[PDB]
Design a protein around this ligand. Structure first.
Ligand SMILES: [Mg+2]
Ligand SMILES: [Mg+2]
Ligand SMILES: [Mg+2]
Ligand SMILES: [Mg+2]
Ligand SMILES: [Mg+2]
Ligand SMILES: [Mg+2]
Ligand SMILES: [Mg+2]
Ligand SMILES: [Mg+2]
Lengths: 312, 293, 290, 319
């Protein structure tokens, strides 16, 4: 039995850094995820049962854990317009609860986060965050579903943990997670078909046709509407997830810094691909503000290759 | 604070509802363990098989259900004045992803035929939180599982599904197998809608029917699994999926019909695992589907 | 089969038992948070909380018109029911700061009354596990709180206290304040028995008596110079425990040897000395004083 | 700010040049085992009654598995194992000596029990031998216990005071709730099994008679008596309220009952670090003792420093 704390300490002592600040960032993250998971599980009872808003609570929990780490200098959070700078080194960028529109339904939602190391000559500015995707040291998400899962990369493949609620421990259940190169599942909001251009529309028409590499069967469709849950299914089963540009969202909806970046990092480390609508590698992009958006297609390498060929 | 046992005594069979809520708490805990069921010992089955076992054991031990239909037993179960028909875990293909799944059940007083002859229906939706949604015959009530206390607590009393909401829930990978009436209605929902600020419907499809329908109850909208060339009688089982959801849906102020627009509660199954197509949800959006056919 | 407490109480007012078991689960969870109740918020006093939890559940039951609570001086009557409840919501208050076993104790009446008149009695013992021990009139049953499911499951059906067992449970710090009869009895249990007794005294009466139920032995809190009428409250501590003990096959008397359940409180907070436990060991005590 | 055990340990260890993470991994193994044991003990009879669709043996197994999985505990002493346990596939950094569930005789009653553990650093260049544990108590590097009662508590020393943590079951995290715990020097509570009065010599018997007499030191009140019968629970109360705990030699237990290596030693280290004292019946410092075998027993008196000073005065006069 391998728990996340031992997994992390063992990884970090490869670098003579078992007690370094990175271990405290991970400790802060896993504490925040267990707290958010429990709070999300209580659902309406949060406001209803006393001692004798849910996305706001998630934000507060995450900010508090990060500050109490003592070593995160800088934090971007989706509901804070401005860069958060703490009094007393890593930068964390996060959507504490993504999929908020699913909360009232009690379906799956999640937390998503990228981690940067402060630039050498830095006391904590937007320069430590407005960077190329390739400078992330780590990325992770917690998927709050019928079970809670933590999926992480430190630059060396992907590992998945399940939360043991009897013990409050993340236990390694999917080591060296690999996304299958081929799987006929696609995940997109076809309600936005009206607003897509012809290239995007015709690709989505293609996946509904019989597929030779799928026994002449068309793709199957799934769309929870919580990006973390859809992409988690994509990691485990294979397939495609997309949120393209459209007339109402000319640059997508995923936030580049703390949603498209971390998911692209995880996806590449699992053997998948992640690109924007133009076929550019997501990790090659650089945000201009902390809340830039990007379109995204990510998932099974074979299926992304099909999208890339279509764009031609 | 109204807990479910209090709700059930005040509304007074009570044993049958007790056995059901017990099974749901047990199944919900097991599902939250996910892979840890086979990895972590005290110091190798499948979740769907365990869920069936938990549910059948609870039913059998109630002492009061003589006859049982479960999605995964081919044959009728005989063990007492009541019968229950159940899918103990629906959305099995979502279990490995840890997304929302659920249990669905219809209850008959004593043997398992016309849909209007259910005395009660309910589901448990195992998502990021666990919910129980229940009808006794007079409206719908929704409960949230408090794991601190191990009690379902009334949180959505007199639940009413909004009459209008532009959300549709369907597997559009099956487009190739739909007839033109179905295909064109789905084409229609993607057009601008005057009743949605000139915007198309938004699409959602978890792929676990109980989760998608639970969202439909709380948000409004449309859920469909129509007939198609590979599933000519649909996918949902009439006896223990379509019937109970239809009964819940009508008691909440919505509609539930098959692909021909026949009311689901009017149907009668010829064998315990009969399938049926279904369109259910907001009354106004189902009226749009009815006008379309 | 797994038998839950709801199944048990319907297979056998039901609303009263359900309000009680709800309160017990809520108090158990709260006590398990201990200091965290005051240090951890939604984003990052215990005896008072337990009282409020119990009173709120009793009021919300609808069925309870009148309640006696150890932490309420005056009788309390609600607006809307045919039953009275008398309770110590957390007994063993002085052990809370140590995190050790404590308990809730309650008696139920239909409609200041004889102990024969209680309809039912129960306690919840919050220890390293949480237990509920109950009687309605025909023997006693013990349940364990399964925290995975939030259900009391029957674990001790038809509980029977062994008639003899050499364990005694008493605060010998009060030896200075006892009369000669009590002093010499306690001196006797330390002599070899055809080995002497073993001593155990958690200091939470519910825990000490729960152990006595399961292993056998004697629990006592006699009159002393500082507490001439004992310390246990007759109405909601001595009564319910005596009811359960007799229904389990044991005995419960006061220092004068009189049956606890024959007594009648004259005020809701009256106190009584008590000796309860294995019938053989209580017999030995009776011989000693009588 | 909420302080969790892992942050507390990591912030402590990163002060040290030579912290490799191995000690943090020992604490992680222990806190994992404590949470698992606490959950198992809360199940009680249900472990044998409720399946998928005895406790002290389970506790021992949980503990051995966690210590082995740490990767860095080379040597393990456990009460229930007759022999010294070696994990040859682990690095030779630490030895752990523990009673995984002490107070077993109380488990059937559902009252408080606990885990007690001492931690030693292996001797330089040791492969892992019984020389690594058969040592003077003053050589422990750390000591802790987990008290499983109506709440679960972890009490710990790393050699500079004592800190107490409460287990948050919603999170599965030990949270710092009693920083820099100090046991009162004076407090009129005594914890002893007076059922054993027959088997004590006259010096012990007369001391226990003294504590039942009026103390001018307590406004002419006697001591109050408490004795759960689980040593970890009674000693935990002693830490938090003050008082005395004792299990002396008696004719049936000529060397007492606590095990020196993994019970008297760690409790004595915690007691001294909280400001109390811990001696045997003869008044010898518990931590000055050396076990001759891993399961040696010792008499013990421990608690508030002023109450132990009274016991020491008594045995000095009685000579
Ligand atoms: Mg968000
Ligand atoms: Mg977001
Ligand atoms: Mg199924
Ligand atoms: Mg099904
Ligand atoms: Mg009280
Ligand atoms: Mg009391
Ligand atoms: Mg032991
Ligand atoms: Mg021991």
């Amino acid at each position: 039995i391998i728990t996340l704390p031992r997994f992390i300490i063992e990884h970090q002592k490869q670098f003579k850094n078992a007690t370094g600040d990175f271990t405290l960032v991970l400790n802060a993250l896993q504490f925040a995820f267990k707290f958010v998971s429990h709070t999300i599980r209580r659902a309406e009872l949060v406001n209803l049962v006393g001692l004798a808003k849910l996305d706001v609570l998630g934000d507060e929990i995450f900010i508090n854990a990060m500050r109490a780490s003592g070593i995160i200098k800088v934090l971007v959070s989706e509901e804070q317009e401005d860069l958060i700078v703490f009094p007393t080194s890593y930068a964390v960028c996060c959507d504490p609860i993504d999929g908020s529109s699913n909360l009232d339904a009690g379906v799956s939602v999640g937390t998503i986060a990228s981690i940067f190391r402060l630039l050498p000559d830095s006391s904590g500015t937007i320069n430590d965050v407005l960077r190329c995707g390739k400078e992330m040291v780590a990325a992770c998400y917690a998927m709050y579903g019928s079970s809670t899962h933590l999926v992480l990369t430190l630059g060396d493949g992907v590992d998945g943990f399940t939360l043991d609620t009897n013990l409050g421990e993340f236990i390694l259940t999917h080591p060296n997670l690999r996304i299958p190169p081929q799987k006929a599942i696609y995940s997109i909001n076809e309600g936005n078909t009206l607003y897509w251009n012809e290239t995007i529309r015709t690709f989505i028409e293609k996946v509904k046709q019989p597929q030779a590499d799928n026994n002449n069967k068309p793709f199957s469709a799934r769309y929870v509407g919580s990006m973390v849950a859809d992409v988690h299914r994509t990691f485990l089963y294979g397939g495609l997830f997309a949120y393209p540009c459209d007339k109402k969202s000319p640059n997508g909806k995923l936030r580049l810094l703390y949603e498209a970046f971390p998911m692209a990092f995880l996806m590449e480390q699992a053997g998948g691909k992640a690109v924007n609508d133009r076929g550019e590698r997501i990790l090659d992009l650089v945000p201009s503000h902390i809340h830039d958006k990007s379109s995204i297609w990510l998932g099974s390498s074979g299926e992304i290759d099909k999208f890339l060929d279509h764009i031609g």
